[PDB]
Chains A and B, each alone.
Chain A
């Protein structure tokens, strides 16, 4: 009493009420609506190959003061322009004018990361060579 129907033959109400009310969940909407397969430029891949269009220096969100060196990349896979982060300070300096990048997601399932403003992707390999190795120097030598 004072709640959901107890009735034996009331499964119909419980199913319809549940079915309709399910949609307000955020994860359920993204997964069960078509927008997933549409609006994501990675289109259900973790990873994508693109080419660097522009090197840009984005200023950090209000609590911090700092310019984050980033790369505007055009995906070859779907022909889409994205802005991607490049980890490693001198690695951006190493990276070339129209570099071929293997870009990934950024640890947050299409949501924003830290003080970066809508930059939802990060480049993790360039010209088939590893970003970590480029950052290291003990590990694998730069490309020719």
Chain B
């Protein structure tokens, strides 16, 4: 029945770890770098 069926998919899926992540820029630095990546050669 539907009471049994509930909660399937999240439990069902084969989860994968999120592994190695390098830290991002913040703030003015992040915005400036983004501005340069979008708009300099690529604008």
With a CB–CB cut-off of 8 A, which chain A residues contact B6? Answer: 57, 69, 89-90, 92-93
Is residue B9 contacting chain A, with contact meaning CB distance below 8 A? yes
User: Distance (Å) between the CB of B5 and the closest chain A CB?
Assistant: 7
| Separation of A92 and B2 alpha carbons in the complex (Å) | 12
Is residue A67 contacting chain B, with contact meaning CB distance below 8 A? yes
Q: Closest residue of chain B to A67, judged by CB?
A: B2
Is residue A122 contacting chain B, with contact meaning CB distance below 8 A? no
| Separation of A89 and B9 alpha carbons in the complex (Å) | 8
- Whether A57 contacts B3 by the Cβ 8 Å rule is yes
Question: Size class of A's contact patch?
Answer: under 10
Chain B contact residues: helix, strand, loop or mixed: helix
- Whether B7 contacts A89 by the Cβ 8 Å rule is yes
- Whether A89 contacts B3 by the Cβ 8 Å rule is no
| Separation of A90 and B6 alpha carbons in the complex (Å) | 7
List 19 A-B residue pairs with CB atoms under 8 Å apart, sorted by A's residue number. Answer: A55-B3, A57-B2, A57-B6, A67-B2, A67-B5, A69-B2, A69-B6, A89-B7, A89-B8, A89-B9, A89-B10, A90-B6, A90-B7, A90-B10, A90-B11, A92-B6, A92-B7, A93-B6, A93-B7
| Separation of A92 and B9 alpha carbons in the complex (Å) | 14
User: Distance (Å) between the CB of A98 and the closest chain B CB?
Assistant: 16
